Amino acid sequence: MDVLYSLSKTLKDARDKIVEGTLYSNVSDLIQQFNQMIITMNGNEFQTGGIGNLPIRNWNFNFGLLGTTLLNLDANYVETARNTIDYFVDFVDNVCMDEMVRESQRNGIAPQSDSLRKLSAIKFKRINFDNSSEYIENWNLQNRRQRTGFTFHKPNIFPYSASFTLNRSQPAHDNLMGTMWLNAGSEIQVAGFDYSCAINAPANIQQFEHIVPLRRVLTTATITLLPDAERFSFPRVINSADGATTWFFNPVILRPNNVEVEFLLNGQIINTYQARFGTIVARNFDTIRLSFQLMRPPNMTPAVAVLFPNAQPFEHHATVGLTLRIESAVCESVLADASETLLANVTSVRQEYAIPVGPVFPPGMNWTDLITNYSPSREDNLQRVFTVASIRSMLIK
Amino acid sequence: MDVLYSLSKTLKDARDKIVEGTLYSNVSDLIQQFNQMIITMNGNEFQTGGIGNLPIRNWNFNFGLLGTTLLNLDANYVETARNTIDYFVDFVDNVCMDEMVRESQRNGIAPQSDSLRKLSAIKFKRINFDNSSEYIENWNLQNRRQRTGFTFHKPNIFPYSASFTLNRSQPAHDNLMGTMWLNAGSEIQVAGFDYSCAINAPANIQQFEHIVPLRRVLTTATITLLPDAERFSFPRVINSADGATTWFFNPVILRPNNVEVEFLLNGQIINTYQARFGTIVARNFDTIRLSFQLMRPPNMTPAVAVLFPNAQPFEHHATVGLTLRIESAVCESVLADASETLLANVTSVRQEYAIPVGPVFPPGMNWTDLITNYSPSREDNLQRVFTVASIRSMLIK
Amino acid sequence: QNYGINLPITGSMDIAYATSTLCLYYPTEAATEINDNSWKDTLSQLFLTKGWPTGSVYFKEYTNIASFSVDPQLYCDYNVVLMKYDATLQLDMSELADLILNEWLCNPMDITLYYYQQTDEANKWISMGSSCTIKVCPLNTQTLGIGCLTTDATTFEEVATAEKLVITDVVDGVNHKLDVTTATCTIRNCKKLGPRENVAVIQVGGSDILDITADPTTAPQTERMMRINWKKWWQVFYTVVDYVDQIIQVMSKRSRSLNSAAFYYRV
Amino acid sequence: QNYGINLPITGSMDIATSTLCLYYPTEAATEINDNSWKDTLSQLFLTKGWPTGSVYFKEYTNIASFSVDPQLYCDYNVVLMKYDATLQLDMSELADLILNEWLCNPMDITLYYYQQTDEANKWISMGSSCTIKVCPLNTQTLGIGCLTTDATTFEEVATAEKLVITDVVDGVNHKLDVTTATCTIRNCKKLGPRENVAVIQVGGSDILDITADPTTAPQTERMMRINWKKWWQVFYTVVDYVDQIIQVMSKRSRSLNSAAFYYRV
C-alpha cells in the first residue's frame, strides 16, 4: 500500500507535469521515476476480481520507455504517455477498490489483497517517489511508532443520541424537572428545565449536571461556547420513557448562572472554564462535564410575576441552556469530518458492488453505530480503509 | 530506548558471565563487546539528577580496556574490572531513576530523560548486545508494528467496584430483590438475592443478570468458574442506595440452574457456555455477561417449608452466587500483574523522591483510578516506565 | 419493583410509539322532576352501547348541596359530579370543588389544649360536620390576647357560622387559640398535596365562579371544570353520556391509587 | 410519569413535619381520675423533642365500636389494646385489619356470587351489627347443606357481629345473606406491610395471629406487650420509651385518605 501511494502520486505527477513544451529537467525527476516503474512493472502478472462484484481482471504490462533526448515536450510524447498512464490509473483504482472491499479482525495493518500482498515483498521495494500528503505520511509514522496526528475541521465525535432524563415528575405531568441534551455531530446543546421555579429548593437554587464520554481523545481542541440552547426553545410534546402517554413543555428561557465547563482527562480537571463563552481551548481532554444551576431571580416585575407562581397550578416552565460546537482538532485516530470524501468514497465503492457486510464494520457503513462500538481492531481497519480512500481521492479527478 | 536494555543486560553479563578462571573463548565475545562499550561511553559529559530531590550529578568516563589475549582467567582481571563495573551499575541505576518519574501528556515513545535523550543518539548505536526478555521484546516489536502481548498470572484487570443493582424494593426494606457483585484484581464474585423466593414471579422462576465491561481486549485466557459464591453468603448490614439509613440482608444459598456465561467481543458473541463449570477458555473478547436463574423448588421438606411461605413476613432470604476468576491471560495493553515487582518499583520510585504530579498519571500510580480511565497515551507513558523498571529489575534491588 | 425512590427514567424522542368503573353523582331535583324508575337502566344501557360494560355504572344521591358536604366519599375510578347552581351559596360550590378537585394529607388536633401555626400557602384548616361556628383569637408571643382575651368565647373573631364545611386560614406565622364545640362538627389541620384528576365537575346554571385555590392572584379555569346550561335535565344527561368519551378524556386514573405509589402516599 | 420503577439505581458500599397519634380505650380516661392530663403529656413530649402540637389522643369506647371503619389520623399511629381472656379473636382481627393495607371492592350480594383470586383475598365486614350467612355451590350450581333459595338453610358464620375477616376456600363460588341496612361487606386482598400503626397490648399473653394461613403466626417488631396495674404507669412506659418505637416505625408509608382500606366505588 506504501507502494500503492507511490504509484498513485507518480501517476498524478505524470498527469500534471507531462505537457507540451516543458523543458526536460523540469520533468527529469519525473521521467527517471516513471520508467523505473516500467522496469519493475513489465512482465508482472496481476489478478483482481474474485470478491464482491469486482470483475476478474488479469493485468500484464509490456509498454516501453518514454523518450529522453527530446528537450521541450510535444503533443506526440504526451499522448503516447497518457496512453499507458490511463491504463496504470485504471489498474491502481481497481486494486484500491480491492483493498477497500474487505475487512479483517486479523490485524488490518497488513495488506488484505493478494495483489498487494505479492507486491509487498522485496521484488518491488524499488517503488517510491515521496510522501507529501497527510495520509501516507501518517501511515508511515504510525507503523514506526512516532508522533501521529490528523487535522480535522468539523468532525463527528459524538454519537448522535437525543434523549432526556427525569428527576421530578408524575403521571399528570404538571410538576417536572430534569434536563434534555443532544450531541449531534460536533454540536452539543443541553437544557435544564424546572416547573416549580425552585419554590421548594433550598434558597432558590437547582443543580444540573451533564456527562459525555468521547469515543477517542483530542488535544489542542478549539471549541465555541454559546449561552443558550438554540434547539430546545419552543413549546412541544414529548413521549414518556414508556411510550404510553405524552406530556407538554412550554419553555420560557432564563439566563443560566454559574455555568461550568470541565474538560477532564482520567479524572484530573485539565481545562477549566467559568462563564467564558466565545471560543475556548482544550489542550487535552477526552471527557466533557457541564455543570450549572437554575437560580430563581430575586426581584420581580408584573409580567415576570404572573409567569412563575408560588401556587401549584403552573403555566410556563423555566429553563437554563447551553450550547457547544467543536471547530477543529488534532487527533490520534481518523474520524469523519466536513472536509473529507473518504468516508464518501468508501461508501460509494462499497455500494456500487453490493458487498455483503463483514463481521467488523456496520451494515452500510452507518456512522453512529460504527462509532458506537469503536474498537482498536476497528480503528486499525478504518485507518487502513481511509488510507485506501485517500489513495483513490488523490487520483479520481 | 533499547540502548538502555543493552546497557543493563551487558552489565548483568559483566557481573556474572565473568568469574575467576574461565577460558578466553567463552566470554571473548563479551570482552570485545565491553571494550567497545567502554570506548563508546567515554568522552561525553553527563549531568544526571536534579528532579524532585534526586541530586544533580556530574559524570565522565575514562578507564583502560580489558585483557584481549589470555589463557585462563585470574583474579587480577576481575579485580581490575569490578570497580568500573559497579560504577556503570550506579550510573545506569541513576538513568533508570531519572527516567522513571517523568511526565509527558502528548508523547511517550521517544526519550524524555536528559542523559537518556542524549544516549539514544545514533552515535552510540554500537551497543545493542541482545534483546531477549519479555518487555524489551514487546517494545522492539511494537516499533515494527506486529502482533504483540504479555502473558499474565493473576492479571489485575477488573477495576475494584462494590456496587449493587436493585430491581425490587420499597422504603420499608422487607422485600428486597436484586444483585450484589464485587470486583478486584483478577476475580469477580456475584450473587443475586430474592426475598420472595420467586413466589410471585411468572413460572416459578426468576432471573439475575450481570454485565462487566473491560477496558482493554484480552485473548486466550483461563477462567476458573466456580458456582458457589463465598463473599455474599452471610448476614450483612449494608447502607441504602442514596443514604439515610442502613438495611439488613440474611441470605441462604441454593444451587443455581440454567446458568449461561458469555464472552462477547465488540458486540459479537465469541464464547458461549451453558452450565459448564471448572476451567474454560477465552479467545477474543472484552465483555462478560452472566445470566442465571433461581427456581422455587417443586417440592419441599419441613424446614424448607417453614422457611419459604407465600406470606408477607419474610425472615430467611435466598441467594445464588457465582465466582469467575481470570487466572492467566495474554494481552496487548500492558497491565500491572502479581508476578513481578514492576508496579511496586514504580510506586516506590515515585514516593522516594517527591515527583511533581500532573494528570499524565493518577497521583501516586495507585492502580484503581489508572485502569478506570485507561488511556492509550497514559498507556504509552506506562509501557515506557515499565520497561525501564524491568530493566532495573535485572541489575539491582 | 423498587417502590422506594424516585429514580431517573429515560426514553427516546424520535421513535414510533402507540375494564374499569364509571359513576354518576346527581342531585335529587333531577329525579324529582323525572318521576320514573327505568331512567337508571336507560342510562346504563345507553352507556353500554357507547362502550362500557354492564355492572360498571353507579349513581349516588345527595338530598341537598349543603348536605353532600358531610365528609363526602369519592372512591370511584372516574367520578363525574353535576352541581346545581345557586345565587346565594358561592363559597359552598367553590369550597366544594376545592376539597374535591384536590387531595389533602391532613392531621387532627385536640382543640381543648393546643396552639397552632400554619406553615405555607398549602396548609389550611378544614372544618366539616353538621354545623360549625368557629372562633379565632391570635396570641401575642407572650401568651396575651390581641383583639380578644383567652378566657371568653365572644371576644374572638368570627369567620363562619353553622356552615356545612369551611376552609379557613390565618396569617401564616402567628400562633392561635381556637374555640368551637367539637360536638357539632370536627376540625382538622389539612394540607392540599396536589390537584386531583379523578373527579370532574359540571356547572348547571350560573357561570364561571369557582376558585380552585385560595390566593386571589390565581383562579384558573382548568380543563377540569366544565359548564353547561339547562331547561330539562334530560338534555343534561344526554349531553353527558354523549361526549362522556371527552369527559373521561380530560380525566386520568387517580395517581394515588395506582400501584406506582405503594409508599409515596396512597389513595 | 410513573415514578420510574423501571430503571435500577446504584449507589455503592463506600458511601454512608412530625405527628403522633395515641389511641387508648375509655376505662383509662376513667382510671386517670383527672381532667387536664393532655397538657402535661404534651409538655413531656416537648421535653423529649416534639413540638407543641404533635401529641394527639383519639378515644374509642371499646374494641367493638372502634372496629367500625378504623381511622388513620397521623403519620405515627400507636394504639393501646385492653386484653380479653374471651374476646381475643376480635382483637387479632383488629390487628390484622389495621396493621396491613387492604384493597377492597364493594359487594352487591343481590345479583352475583363471588370467588377469590388468590390466597391473599378475604372479606372484611363492618358495622354495628353484622349477620353473615353463607353457603357454597356445586359444579351445576346447587345448594349444599342449604336450600339455595331458603335463608334459614344458610350457614351462620358470624352472628349480628361487629367486625369479621372472612376467608373461604379459593376456586369455589358462594351465595350470601346479609341485612345490609345494618352492615357492610367488602371483597379485598392484602397488599402488604404498613409501618405507620403499632399496637401495645396492655396485659395479655401475646395471642396475635395476623395470618389466615395457620402454618405461621409470627410477630413483627410492631406488636409490643406490656403488663399494667394503673394506666399512668403505662403512659409513662410509652412516653419514656418513644425512641425505640419510632425506630421501629417508618413514616414514609402514610396513606393520603383516612380509611384503612382502599375503596373502589
Mutation site for C-interface testing, chosen from B164, B166, B195, B312 by largest number of C Cβ within 10 Å: B166
Longest dimension (CA), chain B: 96
* The three three-digit cell numbers of residue C111, written as one number: 382543640
Angle between helices B2-17 and B75-99 (to 10 degrees): 150
CA distance linking residue B139 with residue D230, whole number of Å: 89
Please provide the DSSP assignment of A293-337 as one string. EEE--SS--HHHHHHS-SSSS---EEEEEEEEEEEEEEESS---B
Using CB atoms, list chains with 3+ pairs below 8 Å to chain A: B, C, D
Interchain CB contact of D16 with B (< 8 Å): yes
Name the strand (E) or helix (H) holding A81. Answer: helix A75-100
Name the strand (E) or helix (H) holding D233. Answer: helix D231-239
Contact C49, C55 (CB under 8 A): no
Sign of the alpha-carbon torsion through D206, D207, D213, D215: positive
Interchain CB contact of B16 with D (< 8 Å): no
Report the residue of chain B nearest A107, measured CA to CA.
B147
Contact A84, A63 (CB under 8 A): yes
Please provide the DSSP assignment of C191-234 as one string. EEEEE--SEEEEEESS-S---SSS-TT-----TTEEEE--SSHH
B105-126 in b/e form (b: 16+ CB < 10 A) is: bbebbebbbbbbeebbeeebee
Chain A residues inside the 8 Å CB shell of B265: 375
* The three three-digit cell numbers of residue B170, written as one number: 420499597
CA distance linking residue B351 with residue B348, whole number of Å: 5
Residue with cell 500483574: B337
Nearest one of B159, B218, B220, B221 to B184, comparing CA atoms: B159
Contact A257, A242 (CB under 8 A): no
* CB neighbour list of residue D120: distance below 8 Å, 6 or more residues apart: D189, D190
Chain C residues inside the 8 Å CB shell of D21: 108
Q: How many CB atoms lie within 10 A of CB C250?
A: 13
Report the residue of chain B nearest D14, measured CA to CA.
B162
A376/B217 touch (CB, cutoff 8 Å), yes or no: yes
Q: Which residues pair with A257 in a beta bridge?
A: A293
Interchain CB contact of A239 with D (< 8 Å): no
Contact A336, A185 (CB under 8 A): no
Contact D202, D81 (CB under 8 A): yes
Numbered residues of the known binding site of B for Ca(2+): 266, 286
* The three three-digit cell numbers of residue D78, written as one number: 400507636
B145/A146 touch (CB, cutoff 8 Å), yes or no: no
Q: Which residues pair with D58 in a beta bridge?
A: D23
**CA distances in angstroms from A136 to A125, A131, A350, A389, listed in the order given:** 16, 6, 22, 11
Look up residue A361 and give its DSSP letter: S
* CB neighbour list of residue A156: distance below 8 Å, 6 or more residues apart: A185, A186, A335, A336, A337, A367, A371
CA distance linking residue D224 with residue D201, whole number of Å: 6
Q: How many CB atoms lie within 10 A of CB C192?
A: 24
**Count of all residues that appear for chain A in the document:** 397
Contact A112, A99 (CB under 8 A): yes
CA distance linking residue D53 with residue D17, whole number of Å: 10
Beta-carbon contacts below 8 Å between A and C: 70
Q: How many CB atoms lie within 10 A of CB C170?
A: 17
* CB neighbour list of residue C44: distance below 8 Å, 6 or more residues apart: C54, C57
Q: How big is chain B by its Cα radius of gyration, in Å? A: 29
Residue C197: what residue type? E
Report the residue of chain B nearest D120, measured CA to CA.
B311
Q: How many CB atoms lie within 10 A of CB C222?
A: 13
Interchain CB contact of D193 with C (< 8 Å): no
Contact D155, D108 (CB under 8 A): no
B313/D216 touch (CB, cutoff 8 Å), yes or no: yes
Q: How many CB atoms lie within 10 A of CB D140?
A: 5
**CA distances in angstroms from B130 to B86, B111, B281, listed in the order given:** 21, 20, 35
Contact B149, B335 (CB under 8 A): no
**Angle, alpha carbons A145-A147-A150 (nearest 5°):** 115
CA distance linking residue C198 with residue D225, whole number of Å: 42
Residue D239: what residue type? V
CA distance linking residue A150 with residue A382, whole number of Å: 14
Contact B283, B270 (CB under 8 A): yes
Residue A241: what residue type? A
CA distance linking residue C91 with residue C97, whole number of Å: 10
Using DSSP's 3-state secondary structure scheme, residue D170 falls into: coil
* CB neighbour list of residue D243: distance below 8 Å, 6 or more residues apart: D48
Q: Which residues pair with A59 in a beta bridge?
A: A46
Contact B194, B254 (CB under 8 A): no
CA distance linking residue A375 with residue A369, whole number of Å: 12
Cα-Cα end-to-end distance for chain D:
25
Interchain CB contact of A265 with B (< 8 Å): yes
CA distance linking residue A200 with residue A198, whole number of Å: 5
**CA distances in angstroms from B166 to A242, B169, B200, C1, listed in the order given:** 19, 7, 17, 8
Chain C residues inside the 8 Å CB shell of D5: 1-3, 7, 260
Distance of CA B327 to the CA centre of its chain: 12
Interchain CB contact of B278 with C (< 8 Å): no
The dihedral formed by the CA atoms of C235, C239, C240 and C244, expressed in degrees to the nearest 10? 160
Helix ranges (DSSP H) in D129-207: none
Name the strand (E) or helix (H) holding A221. Answer: strand A205-226
Residue A92: what residue type? V
Name the strand (E) or helix (H) holding A10. Answer: helix A2-17
Q: How many CB atoms lie within 10 A of CB B128?
A: 14
D255/C262 touch (CB, cutoff 8 Å), yes or no: no
A39-64 in b/e form (b: 16+ CB < 10 A) is: ebbeeeebebeeebebeeeebebeee
3-state secondary structure chain B: CHHHHHHHHHHHHHHHHCCCCCEHHHHHHHHHHHHHHHHHHCCCCEECCCCCCCCCCEECCCCCCCCCCCCECCHHHHHHHHHHHHHHHHHHHHHHHHHCCCCCCCCCCCCCCHHHHHHCCHHHCCCCCCCCCHHHHHHHHHHCCCCCCEEEECECCEEEEEEEEEEEECCCCCCCEEEEEEEEECEEEEEEEECCCCCCCHHHEEEEEEEEEEEEEEEEEEEEEECCCCCCCCCEEEECCCCCCEEEECCCECCCEEEEEEEEECCEEEEEEECCCEEEEECCEEEEEEEEEEECCCCCCHHHHHHCCCCCCCCCCEEEEEEEEEEEEEECCCCCECCCCHHHHHHHHHHHHCCCCCCCCCCCCCHHHHHHCCCHHHHHHHHHHHHHHHHHCCCCC
CA distance C13 to chain B (A): 25
Resolution of the coordinates, Å: 4.5
CA distance linking residue D104 with residue A198, whole number of Å: 39
CA distance linking residue C232 with residue D28, whole number of Å: 59
Residues 36-55 of C with CB under 8 A from B: none
Q: Is D244 annotated as a binding residue?
A: no
